[PDB]
Amino acid sequence: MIQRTPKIQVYSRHPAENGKSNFLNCYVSGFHPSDIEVDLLKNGERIEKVEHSDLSFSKDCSFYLLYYTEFTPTEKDEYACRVNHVTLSQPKIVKWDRDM
């Protein structure tokens, strides 16, 4: 058996083909086993509608998850990604750096 803790990156992007739209991304990478729970949060609350959840795996059987959705941030609103996995003693909350 092998177990590997996910790396978690939270960032924003505009698709080039629609620059007006902004997406909040949580990239959860290099984890094993594949069992996992990932949410996006707004002001500490679970965002229910997340339109995209793309899972893949590599040759060495690590898993990769891109979890993202369209959003409109304001300076007042705090966003984060919350991840629970077997390798983590408590859910991990990674805050979005608004400049990212």
Swiss-Prot record:
The modification Pyrrolidone carboxylic acid is found at Q3. GO terms for molecular function: identical protein binding; MHC class II protein complex binding; peptide antigen binding; protein homodimerization activity; structural molecule activity. Keywords: Amyloid, Amyloidosis, Disease variant, Disulfide bond, Glycation, Glycoprotein, Immunity, Immunoglobulin domain, MHC I, Pyrrolidone carboxylic acid, Secreted, Signal. GO terms for biological process: amyloid fibril formation; antigen processing and presentation of endogenous peptide antigen via MHC class I; antigen processing and presentation of exogenous peptide antigen via MHC class II; antigen processing and presentation of exogenous protein antigen via MHC class Ib, TAP-dependent; cellular response to iron ion; cellular response to iron(III) ion; cellular response to nicotine; intracellular iron ion homeostasis. Residues 6-94 form the Ig-like C1-type domain. The keyword Glycoprotein applies. Glycans are attached at I2, K20, K42, K49, K59, K92, K95. It comes from the Eukaryota. Changing D77N: In AMYLD6; reduced stability; in contrast to the wild-type, the mutant aggregates into fibrils with classic amyloid-like properties under physiologic solvent conditions. It is found in: Secreted; Cell surface. Disulfide bonds join C26-C81. Glycation of Ile-2 is observed in long-term hemodialysis patients. GO terms for cellular component: cytosol; early endosome lumen; early endosome membrane; endoplasmic reticulum; endoplasmic reticulum lumen; ER to Golgi transport vesicle membrane; external side of plasma membrane; extracellular exosome. Its main location: secreted. It is linked to Immunodeficiency 43: A disorder characterized by marked reduction in serum concentrations of immunoglobulins and albumin, and hypoproteinemia due to hypercatabolism. Patients may suffer from recurrent respiratory tract infections and severe skin disease. Amyloidosis, hereditary systemic 6: A form of hereditary systemic amyloidosis, a disorder characterized by amyloid deposition in multiple tissues resulting in a wide clinical spectrum. AMYLD6 is mainly characterized by gastrointestinal and cardiac symptoms. Neurologic involvement, sicca syndrome, and carpal tunnel syndrome may also be present. Inheritance is autosomal dominant. Heterodimer of an alpha chain and a beta chain. Beta-2-microglobulin is the beta-chain of major histocompatibility complex class I molecules. Polymers of beta 2-microglobulin can be found in tissues from patients on long-term hemodialysis. B2M alone (not in complex with HLA-I) interacts with M.tuberculosis EsxA (ESAT-6) and an EsxA-EsxB (CFP-10) complex; the tripartite complex can be detected in the host endoplasmic reticulum. The B2M-EsxA complex can be detected in patients with pleural tuberculosis and is stable from pH 4.0 to 8.0 and in the presence of 2M NaCl. Component of the class I major histocompatibility complex (MHC). Involved in the presentation of peptide antigens to the immune system. Exogenously applied M.tuberculosis EsxA or EsxA-EsxB (or EsxA expressed in host) binds B2M and decreases its export to the cell surface (total protein levels do not change), probably leading to defects in class I antigen presentation. Belongs to the beta-2-microglobulin family. This is Beta-2-microglobulin. It comes from Homo sapiens (Human). The lineage of its organism: Eukaryota, Metazoa, Chordata, Craniata, Vertebrata.
